[PDB]
């Protein structure tokens, strides 16, 4: 049976011990030839690998090249976010810009943003770099923690980045992660991903790429795109809503088997009328996914407990019924 972590404690320990000295090459990618970019990657790797769970996120200074790119991307993308964006995304950056400091002239840090997300939506960011496997990334998603990188895309191609960077995750992902319903929907995916077999890991991971990175929804009577990739690429932002690419109703099985492409735009899209429809369907899909047990999350301790015996189920149930009694007394007091 595949091994999976049980809580954040082993996640940092085992993952930071077995893995070591794994620098990224990315030579064939556009740019990545200047020695400065290599130094930044080394700086990010040392900050990431040596980081321990629960410690504050180290601050990283930014030179002119990255700040200038942030200003250009922020100004261009911000002027287009009025269209093709989703309701939660709009107020997402609106509060963030007023509080997190999102501006073209001012690129925010990680510690300040991480505090804001955890305080509001209970989300924390792990500044990881290099290659990320599937199980570890999904496991982090289960704990409601999103892996992130400190460096940004190469200045050679400001419009698009061959590999995900800070700006891509910050713009495409951060506004969506702020959504409470979406946050819970993402968390369920992580829990389901835990303990998934080799094929199952691919199956569940396939939905993320076709749902999180690229996604469509119909709210307020108009269709909008919520996928991080759709809102991250200016060219893809117009293409996603364009009728040229294929658009189909969201389907778990279809997305997990639908063929994909790399280094190219996307023509196959899945659209969900409401996020809740995706939520329960995945949970039903997860139930359909064979597993010798289940999984539960405890926010009181940020721990994960296996669900394989009735006694464990009763343990959680007892706490559940306690809340109802507390709420019932509150209802009696009120009115």
């Amino acid at each position: 049976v595949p091994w999976f972590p049980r809580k954040v404690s082993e996640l940092d320990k085992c993952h930071h011990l077995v893995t070591k000295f794994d620098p990224d090459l990315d030579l064939d990618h556009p740019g990545f030839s200047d020695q400065v970019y290599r130094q930044r990657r080394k700086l990010i790797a040392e900050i990431a690998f040596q980081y321990r769970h629960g410690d504050p996120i180290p601050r990283v200074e930014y030179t002119a090249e990255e700040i200038a790119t942030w200003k250009e991307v922020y100004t261009t993308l911000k002027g287009l976010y009025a269209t093709h964006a989703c309701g939660e995304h709009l107020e997402a950056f609106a509060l963030l810009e007023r509080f997190s400091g999102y501006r073209e002239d001012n690129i925010p840090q990680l510690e300040d943003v991480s505090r804001f997300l955890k305080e509001r939506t209970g989300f924390q960011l792990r500044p990881v770099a290099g290659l990320l496997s599937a199980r570890d990334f999904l496991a982090s998603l289960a704990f409601r923690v999103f892996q992130c990188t400190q460096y940004i895309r190469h200045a050679s191609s400001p419009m698009h980045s061959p590999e995900p960077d800070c700006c891509h995750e910050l713009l495409g992902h951060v506004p969506m992660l702020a959504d409470r319903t979406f946050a819970q929907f993402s968390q369920d995916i992580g829990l389901a991903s835990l303990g998934a077999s080799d094929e199952e890991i691919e199956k569940l991971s396939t939905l993320y790429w076709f749902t999180v990175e690229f996604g469509l929804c119909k709210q307020n009577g108009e269709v909008k795109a919520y996928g991080a990739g759709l809102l991250s690429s200016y060219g893809e932002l117009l293409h996603c809503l364009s009728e040229e690419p294929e658009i189909r109703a969201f389907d778990p099985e279809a997305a997990a088997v639908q063929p994909y492409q790399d280094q190219t735009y996307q023509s196959v899209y899945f659209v969900s009328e409401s996020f809740s429809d995706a939520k329960d369907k995945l949970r039903s899909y997860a139930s359909r996914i064979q597993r010798p047990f289940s999984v539960k999350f405890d926010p009181y301790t940020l721990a994960i407990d296996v669900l394989d015996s009735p006694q464990a189920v009763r343990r959680s149930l007892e706490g559940v019924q306690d809340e109802l009694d507390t709420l019932a007394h509150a209802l009696s007091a009120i009115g």
Binding site: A134, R135, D198, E199, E202, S205, Y260, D262
Partner: peptide, 18 residues
Amino acid sequence: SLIEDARKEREAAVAAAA
């Protein structure tokens, strides 16, 4: 990118099998 991850996980898992 998930395509490469899926094959990478599959080949790594089956590498020890043989």
